[PDB]
Amino acid sequence: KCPLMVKVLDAVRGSPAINVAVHVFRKAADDTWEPFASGKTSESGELHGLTTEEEFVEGIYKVEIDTKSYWKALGISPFHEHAEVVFTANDSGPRRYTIAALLSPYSYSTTAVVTN
């Protein structure tokens, strides 16, 4: 199945954070973020299918979540421009990764569930 899944939750409304812009990058030889993958969260708050076992290779990744778009489209003025999660992936055998972010105007938490 999917080596990378993102999940987003709204801490204010107690529900799936639907249609959130999520962008992914892989750090380059030259320290530049190369556009890698892109999408929007489904009904359940879940971006599935971002990449494939093969294409997702050892490196450093930045998952950027467009929290600010979400909050403004609802009429709240957020504190954060976006939410970055920067991590090394695939350096330690073949594994599945799950980013989960829980959103608030002036706050967010992110967590990882990597499976052996």
């Binding site: 204010v12 409304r13 107690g14 609802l74 009429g75 709240i76």
Partner: protein, 176 residues
């Protein structure tokens, strides 16, 4: 000299849920503490298979600092000894919206033009009201004929709420 005990207030005689059903625009509201519905308030009243009344209001709510949202409210009415007095259980489709359970009184209506509703949330020990809200509704959003307005003012006076109602604005803020 004016008796202000809530139990002394005239309510609708032989109130008829069926003639009350349909759309009612909120034209004026007296706010309670912790006011909820701001403006753009429109209610839709129905009667059940079983004869129970229920309703389904829409309105602008100003949350937090200044977060505005269109609330879809829903309320169900249980009956009492008195055909014009109900217990209203209510919540919004969105759960972060206010929930509760309020007495719900049809103080007066002619079914075709206007209704005056009243709710007492908290009592003083002499039986007078410590926290109440009251809505004036109309079948027609543009306003009331002079005969209706006159009755309405008289009812506002009897609820000991004269001059305390805020005017409700309708500007299509909640359009699908």
């Amino acid at each position: 000299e004016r008796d202000c005990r809530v139990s002394s207030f005239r309510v609708k005689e032989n109130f008829d849920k069926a003639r009350f059903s349909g759309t009612w625009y909120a034209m004026a509201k007296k706010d309670p503490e912790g006011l909820f519905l701001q403006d753009n308030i429109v209610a839709e009243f129905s009667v059940d298979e079983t004869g129970q009344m229920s309703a389904t209001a829409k309105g602008r709510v100003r949350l937090l600092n200044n977060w505005d949202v269109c609330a879809d409210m829903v309320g169900t009415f249980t009956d009492t000894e008195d055909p014009a007095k109900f217990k209203m259980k209510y919540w919004g489709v969105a759960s972060f919206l206010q929930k509760g359970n309020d007495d719900h009184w049809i103080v007066d209506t002619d079914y075709d033009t206007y209704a005056v509703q009243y709710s007492c949330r908290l009592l003083n020990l002499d039986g007078t009201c410590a926290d109440s809200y009251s809505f004036v509704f109309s079948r027609d959003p543009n306003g009331l004929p002079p005969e209706a307005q006159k009755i309405v003012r008289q009812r506002q006076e009897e609820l000991c709420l004269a001059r305390q109602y805020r005017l409700i604005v309708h500007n299509g803020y909640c359009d699908g």
